[PDB]
């Protein structure tokens, strides 16, 4: 777990930088406020990572719960990345093509 966290600290800093950049430019109206969706995605990704990483470290007692948390974290991160950014874009593309 310590080695995994050491490997993932680069991605943690990467997410922190992305969230900072998203917060810096939040009110960009391009593509129907795409910056707002990007910022929301970054905020909720930071929230879920902050709520997951200590949980992942502390659930080392049982392998089943550790693996479940590891899978659920990345799965929900993928669903966030899809449904907070591409989903409004897909809805505008398909449901409102005018």
């Amino acid at each position: 777990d310590s080695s995994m966290l050491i490997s993932l600290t680069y991605d943690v800093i990467l997410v922190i930088l992305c969230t900072v950049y998203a917060f810096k430019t939040r009110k960009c109206p391009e593509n129907f406020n795409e910056a707002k969706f990007i910022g929301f995605t970054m905020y909720t990704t930071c929230i879920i990572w902050l709520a997951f990483l200590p949980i992942f470290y502390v659930t080392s007692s049982d392998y089943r719960v550790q693996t479940t948390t590891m899978c659920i974290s990345v799965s929900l991160s993928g669903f966030v990345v899809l449904g907070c950014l591409f989903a409004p874009k897909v809805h505008i593309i398909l449901f409102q093509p005018q």
Partner: protein, 347 residues
């Protein structure tokens, strides 16, 4: 003694006469586009001639141009049947009818308020097409209604400019202040800035009084005073375009727990900003490279239409940073006779 501007078709006898090339607005009312057309009796069944006033709006950015898309829309299109095979006339129109003859068919357009002024974005060397911005055009079609296609020979295209002038009331002078608390205990830094006036004419000097009160543990390195121009693009949700048309950096430092007042002179002009692609400038007819875009006045109690141009003097002090903005209007005054709308010395 009065004179008008005449535009003639390449072929046939279709001449459009307009009294003035600038149709200004007074917020409450807009000067009507009044003109006349002479058309020879060369038609048998197509006894209908139409005049269209189009407030076209085009936009293109460097990234968009590279990608291959340029936004285009028609903000307001008005069609008037010039030939009546009601509608009060004016003295100028009556004089034009009397001088031209019986064939002089009048046409009058009442431009609705809350419409953007004629402002054209400055195009780069790569751009060689239609001018980017809001352009007002009058097009005369000698064809059976709008069903038939537009013919270049028949249609008469003339570019008109709708511009606003400085208001009678100068308005309160800008005075912007900002106090910042540093992270090191409670050490306040105070910045204040003021302008000589609120309404500014193009080419006139701008005097900014800046006063700094340092009660901190740091010394200000440099002071950057700039004249930012903002071009809000309501349509297509385009991001705001911000461009520094003039800048001045001062290396003077202010000691902590001390006061320092100074005056700075900034005179925006187009010669230094000629290389800034996408900059908004006054309306153009045949690429005369007019002055900077006059800051539109949103006196209406405020609609998201067209391009909204504004100017703000920004003062920034480093050692994060303290930034303050003072809005001001850079608009032309009312000309005595008329705006020539071209380089008065042609060569």
């Amino acid at each position: 003694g009065t004179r008008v501007f005449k535009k003639a078709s390449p072929n046939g006898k279709l001449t459009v006469y307009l009294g003035k090339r600038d149709f200004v607005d007074h917020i409450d009312l807009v000067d009507p586009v009044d003109g006349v057309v002479l058309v020879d009796p060369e038609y048998l069944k197509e006894r209908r001639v139409y005049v269209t006033l189009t407030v076209a709006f085009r936009y293109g950015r460097e990234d968009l141009d590279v990608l291959g898309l340029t936004f285009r829309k028609d903000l307001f299109v008005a069609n008037v049947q010039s030939f009546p095979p009601k509608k009060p006339l004016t003295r100028l129109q009556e004089r034009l009818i009397k001088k031209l003859g019986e064939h002089a068919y009048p046409f009058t357009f009442e431009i609705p308020p809350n419409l953007p002024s004629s402002v054209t974005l400055q195009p780069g060397p790569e751009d060689t097409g239609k001018a980017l911005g809001v352009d007002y055009e009058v097009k005369a079609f000698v064809a059976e209604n709008l069903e038939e296609k537009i013919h270049k020979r028949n249609s008469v295209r003339l570019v008109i400019e709708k511009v606003q002038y400085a208001p009678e009331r100068p308005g309160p002078q800008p005075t912007a202040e900002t106090t910042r608390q540093f992270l090191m205990s409670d050490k306040p830094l105070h910045l204040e800035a003021s302008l000589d006036k609120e309404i500014y004419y193009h080419g006139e000097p701008i005097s900014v009084n800046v006063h700094v009160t340092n009660n901190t543990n740091k010394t200000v390195k440099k002071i950057k005073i700039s004249v930012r121009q903002y071009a809000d693009i309501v349509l297509f949700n385009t991001a705001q375009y911000k461009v520094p048309v003039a800048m001045e950096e001062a290396d003077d430092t202010v000691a902590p727990s001390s006061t320092f007042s100074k005056v700075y002179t900034l005179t925006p002009f187009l010669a230094n900003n000629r290389e800034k692609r996408g900059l908004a400038l006054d309306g153009k007819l045949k690429h005369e490279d007019t002055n900077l875009a006059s800051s539109t006045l949103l006196r209406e109690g405020r609609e998201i239409l067209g391009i909204i141009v504004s100017y703000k003097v920004k003062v920034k002090l480093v050692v994060s940073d303290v930034a303050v903005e003072l809005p001001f209007t850079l608009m032309h005054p009312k000309p005595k006779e008329e705006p020539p709308h071209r380089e008065v010395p042609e060569n």
